[PDB]
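Hi W.,

Here's what went into the run:
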Amino acid sequence: GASPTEGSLTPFIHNAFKADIQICILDGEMMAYNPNTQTFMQKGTKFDIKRMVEDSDLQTCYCVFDVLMVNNKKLGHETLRKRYEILSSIFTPIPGRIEIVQKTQAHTKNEVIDALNEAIDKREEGIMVKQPLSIYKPDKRGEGWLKIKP
DNA sequence: AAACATTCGTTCACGTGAGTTCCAGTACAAGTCTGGTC
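Here's what came out:
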């Protein structure tokens, strides 16, 4: 949906943005949410989030992890911490339709292994790590973002 | 007074360090390939 009147995810989150924010760019991941369990349907069997069938009870959820512009302010060159803080003041999350990915501060390896073990326990792919001072470099790989899997 | 031994500047050979050119190997970007799913 390109307008609040008609869409599959936008008609519900039109009014989820604080009044001050008028121009806003966000980056995130789109996934499928099962409400009867209140759990995210892991990608794979029984559904594709690209061409979901209307009759299905599953719905679309947007998990945000970055902001690149708010009220004609260019946040590309700022540090990750600042972008996170500004992101916290964009929308009031409304579970099931738009959310912010939680990030935990960690400064030891035991924490990383604990997180990976817990992720495997919750049947997730893995865990990723972000450098607090990393800048957004479009199209580049392995600059401030790292991923870890079993 | 004559013969023999020692010494010194000279010569050759051999060994070691530094500069130059050519080539083997390595890390990573990008192209290409492929599987599964709806």
